[PDB]
Each structure stands twice: as structure tokens, then as C-alpha cells.
Write a protein that binds this ligand. Structure first.
Ligand SMILES: *[C@@]12=NC3=[C]C([C])=C([C])[C]=C3N([C][C]([O])[C]([O])[C]([O])[C]OP([O])([O])=O)C1=NC(=O)[N]C2=O
Length: 109
């Protein structure tokens, strides 16, 4: 299929820290696990990131809904790329959100 990356965020912590990332994510972004795990995904954002889209994900996470936004992100070396990003809430049987899982596709084409 298409080249994509995958992460898991822990929603049982107040600021959805990332707890797992596929090989592709580290390779796409240039950041290592020591700089990715424990942190919130937003460190990939920068000057040109549309705050109206950042808002759509903030709201969707607060409400525990899925969400798909297209964000401008930056690699560790500062070069930008276009991140088509899809967040999925993972609920426990009691209805609580336990994790958010994300598929991120570099759609710079
Ligand atoms: C990021 N991917 C990503 C993956 C998951 C599973 C989740 C839950 C979030 C992201 N983000 C966004 C970030 O964590 C945050 O949710 C939003 O920026 C909005 O909240 P704030 O407090 O910042 O307004 C991702 N952000 C990226 O920029 N790139 C991704 O790959």
C-alpha cells in the first residue's frame, strides 16, 4: 500500500504522551525514541502549522472522537513536510478512552 507510520498515545495521562512508534515514524521525522517517547506529538509542529487544524485535533481528543487533519510538520533537521494525520480513540468497555492511535502519511508527494 502507501507508505505510512503509526503511533500510540496514552490517554490515561493528561497530555496524551506517545508511548509507541513504528520504525517509519522515527525514520520519517528524524527523531529517535529518546526524543519521541514520553512526549506529546506536537513537537513536530512549527511556524507554518495551521492553528485552525491543530484546534480540530485538540477538540477531537477532548471529546474522544476520531479525527483527520492535514498538518505541516517539521523534521528534526527543520525541513517541513505535509502530514496527513488520523487519530482514533480506543475505548475500554466502560466507555473511557484509554489510548489514541494515529496513522501519519507524508503526503508532500
Ligand atoms: C502527531 N500525531 C499525533 C498522534 C496521536 C495519536 C495523537 C493523539 C496526537 C498527535 N498529534 C497532535 C498533538 O498530540 C495534539 O493532539 C495536537 O497538536 C492538538 O493539541 P494541542 O494542545 O497541541 O493544541 C500530532 N501532531 C503533529 O503535529 N504531528 C503528528 O504526527
Amino acid at each position: 500500500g502507501l507508505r505510512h507510520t503509526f503511533v500510540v498515545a496514552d490517554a490515561t495521562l493528561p497530555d496524551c504522551p506517545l508511548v509507541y512508534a513504528s520504525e517509519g515514524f522515527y525514520a520519517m521525522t528524524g527523531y529517535g525514541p529518546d526524543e519521541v517517547l514520553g512526549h506529546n506529538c506536537r513537537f513536530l509542529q512549527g511556524e507554518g502549522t495551521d492553528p485552525k487544524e491543530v484546534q480540530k485535533i485538540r477538540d477531537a481528543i477532548k471529546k474522544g472522537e476520531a479525527c483527520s487533519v492535514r498538518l505541516l510538520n517539521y523534521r528534526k533537521d527543520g525541513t517541513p513536510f505535509w502530514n496527513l494525520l488520523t487519530v482514533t480513540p480506543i475505548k475500554t468497555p466502560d466507555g473511557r478512552v484509554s489510548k489514541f492511535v494515529g496513522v501519519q502519511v507524508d503526503v508532500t508527494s
